[PDB]
């Protein structure tokens, strides 16, 4: 499936000092006219490890996938999180041009359902699977005023991939201020890529069925 | 949304019929479903179809006995079936399809018709 | 039922304006909207919500609601606009159902 959302516009990313120079992404950015929306989320490069941070309001990123050409030639690492339980998965996943975790509607039940075959087609010769609480918790509150940020540490060069995380209040606007689980997977990792969720209705005539929308969100990164 | 529903019958009275609607481009999960009737001449007669309200669905008071409605989920038709035909049963039958999340005031995409006879 | 007239008349360029009226619990309560069919083709939604266009619908045309009767607008009429149109609401009983009116042939001399 895996309808081609692409985006036109790109722009060199701006940078910020880290308090080193990383890079600031913009996954969905809102336009002048509020119409149009740019989903562009690259694939990049992991030279020995990445320093991964985001301020967030909406569960807009559920997860990470990893791995060297990200097709069925080779295993790959896929992470997604429910709103209760985080699922770690090592299979031969053939993934599509453009993964994104779809969540629609389901008329039957007052429910939300999300399904994961709008990111890969098919799955083969399966090895390690896990299961845990969550890692993307909510903060335990705060009143708005950047109401979270969260920051994670990817290391692999020991023969182990090595989750850190910590989660903290903030003030400061639109710049870093100056204010989990250890897993025995065998594999070669060298590009990864995040991976949003984007939502769906039917509500006005007309429209086409890529209605597929979701709000703001950015991200920055740096490497060891 | 696009639509596309089985073709004629012809039959004796008495019988019952059954028309199917296959819808593509979307998921039938997420839309609600109705039918509607036009007899040679005359104004549409709506025949039922789902109520958000109530999740469930609600059938046109001069048919409540005669009718069923039923999805085959797994490959997204859904089916109307209709008992005790007769010859004023002869009409158009169209499906048409709107808002799930809330009661709307319109039917967006209709299909291209089928039309049923009976005679003799 | 909600009642319509059977027939309006003109030549292009004219107005012309359709009616549909009944009672209040079908027209007062709740929104209207509106149908073209041309003979021999599927019907199609011109209005909704007493006033919104979808996409494509050119601009001769209009709505309006006057307590439990509404009207169409046609401007600027043009030969190819010989079809039925048909008011349709839900019915607010609790005998709960949509109700659709009783339509109008449109002609143009």
């Not at chain 1, 010769?125 to 903060?139: A, R």
């Not at chain 3, 439990?68 to 046609?74: P, V």
Request: net charge neutral; with cysteine.
């Amino acid at each position: 499936q895996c309808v081609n959302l692409t985006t036109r516009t790109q722009l060199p990313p701006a940078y910020t000092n880290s308090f080193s120079n990383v890079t600031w992404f913009h996954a969905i950015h809102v336009s002048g006219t509020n119409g149009t929306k740019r989903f562009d989320n690259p694939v990049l490069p992991f030279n020995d490890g990445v320093y991964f941070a985001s301020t967030e309001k909406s569960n807009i990123i559920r997860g990470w996938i990893f791995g060297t050409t990200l097709d069925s030639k080779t295993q790959s690492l896929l992470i997604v999180n429910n709103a209760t339980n985080v699922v770690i998965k090592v299979c031969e996943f053939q993934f599509c041009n453009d993964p994104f975790l779809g969540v629609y509607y389901h008329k039957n039940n007052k429910s939300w359902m999300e399904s994961e075959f709008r990111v890969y087609s098919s799955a083969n010769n399966c090895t390690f699977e896990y299961v845990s609480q969550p890692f993307l918790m909510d903060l335990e509150g705060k009143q708005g005023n950047f109401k979270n940020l969260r920051e994670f540490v990817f290391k692999n060069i020991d023969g182990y991939f090595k989750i850190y995380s910590k989660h903290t209040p903030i003030n400061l606007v639109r710049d870093l201020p100056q204010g989990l689980v250890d897993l025995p997977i065998g594999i070669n990792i060298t590009r990864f890529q995040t991976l949003l969720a984007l939502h769906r209705s039917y509500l006005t005539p007309g429209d086409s069925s890529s209605g597929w929308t979701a709000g703001a969100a950015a991200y920055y990164v740096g490497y060891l | 949304v696009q639509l596309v529903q089985s073709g004629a019958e012809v039959k004796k009275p008495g019988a019952s019929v059954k028309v199917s609607c296959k819808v593509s481009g979307y998921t039938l999960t997420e839309l609600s479903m109705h039918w509607v009737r036009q007899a040679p001449g005359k104004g549409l007669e709506w025949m039922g179809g789902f109520d958000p309200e109530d999740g469930e669905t609600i059938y046109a008071q001069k048919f409540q006995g005669r009718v069923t409605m039923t999805e085959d989920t797994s490959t997204d038709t859904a089916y109307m079936e209709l008992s005790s035909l007769r010859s004023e049963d002869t009409a158009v039958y169209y499906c048409a399809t709107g808002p799930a999340v809330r009661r709307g005031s319109w039917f967006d995409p209709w299909g291209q018709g089928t039309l049923v006879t009976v005679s003799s | 039922v909600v009642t319509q007239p059977p027939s309006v008349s003109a030549a292009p360029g004219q107005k012309v304006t359709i009616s549909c009226s009944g009672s209040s619990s079908n027209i007062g309560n709740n929104y209207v909207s509106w149908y073209q069919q041309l003979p021999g083709t599927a019907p199609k939604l011109l209005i909704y919500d007493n006033n919104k266009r979808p996409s494509g619908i050119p601009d001769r045309f209009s709505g309006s609601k006057s307590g439990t009767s509404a009207t169409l607008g046609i401007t600027g009429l043009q030969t190819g606009d010989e079809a039925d149109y048909y008011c349709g609401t839900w019915d607010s009983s609790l005998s709960a159902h949509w109700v659709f009116g009783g339509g109008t042939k449109l002609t143009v001399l």
